[PDB]
Amino acid sequence: EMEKEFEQIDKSGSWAAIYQDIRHEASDFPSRVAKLPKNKNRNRYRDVSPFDHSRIKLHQEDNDYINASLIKMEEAQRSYILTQGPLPNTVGHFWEMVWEQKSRGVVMLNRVMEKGSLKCAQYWPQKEEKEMIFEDTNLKLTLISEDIKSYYTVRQLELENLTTQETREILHFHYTTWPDFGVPESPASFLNFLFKVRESGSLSPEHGPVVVHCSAGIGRSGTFCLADTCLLLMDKRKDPSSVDIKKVLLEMRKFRMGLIQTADQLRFSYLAVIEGAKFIM
């Protein structure tokens, strides 16, 4: 059981060691499309690339590339799209992907500015009366409502395909309190946030996969998917303690490199799953 494994690693201070074993066992697949010269300005970080096999393709004949990966967890019946925070030049691609994949929710785990630098373009409207038009992808985006809470903000957005005049409601879940350095001290507000996304229906199989991002789409974004999938598997299985976090992480790393960036994020993921299991048992 992971609670006992937690105390062991913690008491022995072995987190950096566990973390390095995961690094060494992780899959390595080609990412040829990401490294094409015509795609250099579509990537926020030169060392964070989607694998070719799991990359999301845009349905535009010109250049189909976005820094985004489909993570398919077969046993849990959960999919996720993990992507980077959009760049000024990819905001239109981001919303085209949301449209084409029939996503119902966007989960944002970063602030637009952290450590005095921009981690993400402002890709949604700040006021009802000031909608955004993406000329490159023929989409209009309107803020419908915004509910600001202590630890997160939920926004209802309307996305309109200007080509067909179809409209969809998108939910934007913005976790606003992840600290600039390290991880939250307690997983309570992160779990509350994760249950709010679940309650919305955004993670349900009647919709396209949820879009999850931070700045690179690997660290905080990884912690989100890892916790959700692990808690779902504990509901589904005859023996809940058959769930090995490390194995689940390695299965997710077949789909996108580098998920969980630090030994601290790994420790936090254990704590979130352990604490979340109490609200699920």
Swiss-Prot record:
Where Phosphoserine occurs, residue numbers? S49, S241, S242
Question: Which positions does the record annotate as the modified residue Cysteine sulfinic acid (-SO2H)?
Answer: C214
Carrying Phosphotyrosine, the residues are Y19, Y65
Which cellular component, as a GO term, is one annotated location?
A: mitochondrial crista
| Annotated GO biological process | actin cytoskeleton organization; cellular response to angiotensin; cellular response to fibroblast growth factor stimulus; cellular response to hypoxia; cellular response to nerve growth factor stimulus; cellular response to nitric oxide; cellular response to platelet-derived growth factor stimulus; cellular response to unfolded protein
**Cysteine sulfenic acid (-SOH): modified positions:** C214
Task: Provide the free-text tissue specificity comment from this protein's UniProt record.
Answer: Expressed in keratinocytes (at protein level).
- Residues of the signal peptide: none
Effect seen on changing C214S: Catalytically inactive mutant; abolishes sulfhydration
Q: How does it sit in the membrane?
A: Peripheral membrane protein
The GO terms this record gives for MF are: cadherin binding; enzyme binding; ephrin receptor binding; insulin receptor binding; non-membrane spanning protein tyrosine phosphatase activity; protein kinase binding; protein phosphatase 2A binding; protein tyrosine phosphatase activity
Question: Which residues does this entry mark as bearing S-nitrosocysteine?
Answer: C214
Stretches assigned to the Tyrosine-protein phosphatase domain: 2-276
Query: In which broad location class does this protein mainly occur, judging by the first location in its UniProt entry?
Result: endoplasmic reticulum
Where, subcellularly, is it found?
A: Endoplasmic reticulum membrane
What family does the entry list? Belongs to the protein-tyrosine phosphatase family. Non-receptor class 1 subfamily.
Q: Subunit arrangement? A: Interacts with EPHA3 (phosphorylated); dephosphorylates EPHA3 and may regulate its trafficking and function. Interacts with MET. Interacts with NCK1.
Q: What is this protein called?
A: Tyrosine-protein phosphatase non-receptor type 1
Name the source organism: Homo sapiens (Human)
Q: Where the shown chain sits in the full protein?
A: 2 to 282 of 435
